[PDB]
Amino acid sequence: ELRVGLEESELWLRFKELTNEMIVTKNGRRMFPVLKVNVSGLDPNAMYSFLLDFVAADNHRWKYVNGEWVPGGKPEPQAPSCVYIHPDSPNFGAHWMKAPVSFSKVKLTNKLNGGGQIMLNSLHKYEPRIHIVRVGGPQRMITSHCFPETQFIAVTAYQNEEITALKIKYN
Numbered sequence: 001e002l003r004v005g006l007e008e009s010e011l012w013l014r015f016k017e018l019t020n021e022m023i024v025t026k027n028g029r030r031m032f033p034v035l036k037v038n039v040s041g042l043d044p045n046a047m048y049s050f051l052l053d054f055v056a057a058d059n060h061r062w063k064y065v066n067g068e069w070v071p072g073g074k075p076e077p078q079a080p081s082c083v084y085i086h087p088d089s090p091n092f093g094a095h096w097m098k099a100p101v102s103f104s105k106v107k108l109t110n111k112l113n114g115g116g117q118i119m120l121n122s123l124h125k126y127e128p129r130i131h132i133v134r135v136g137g138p139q140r141m142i143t144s145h146c147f148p149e150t151q152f153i154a155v156t157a158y159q160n161e162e163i164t165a166l167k168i169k170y171n
């Protein structure tokens, strides 16, 4: 059985208990914390690509009102985000299982942009998700995994200073 685990869940849970925020910019901003995944049970000799996307956790616009995040009352169906290909892709199962798979180079933006950067709906809440795609082989296969611990609201600047402080303390 293919096992997928979050590395540094301890730290993600500290962010999640405050409501996590990730900055989006026109040019794109890297994530802190970085999503790092522990993977076991791959065929060391099989070929895989690691994909990252962001699911809109709900259909609402969120606003920081008197020290607290609150959802709007006017939902709107959320279009799926684009997929980021881990730059080590494609690679042998052995490569992926030898150290945590680290999505350190994904950049989050608020503007339709050249290549790489993943565009998000601003002030929407997101749940990171990976797809492990077995490629090249006869039988194509996809395994998906969500990371609720890593949920965040996309922001153009931090709203909760407690988040600002944690981001600096642990970077």
Ligand SMILES: COc1ccc(C)cc1NC(=O)CN
Residues within 6 Å of the ligand: 076, 077, 078, 079, 080, 081, 082, 119, 120, 121, 122
């Ligand atoms: C600013 O709009 C967006 C940017 C990025 C993504 C993933 C979705 C949307 N909008 C929607 O999904 C609304 N149909």
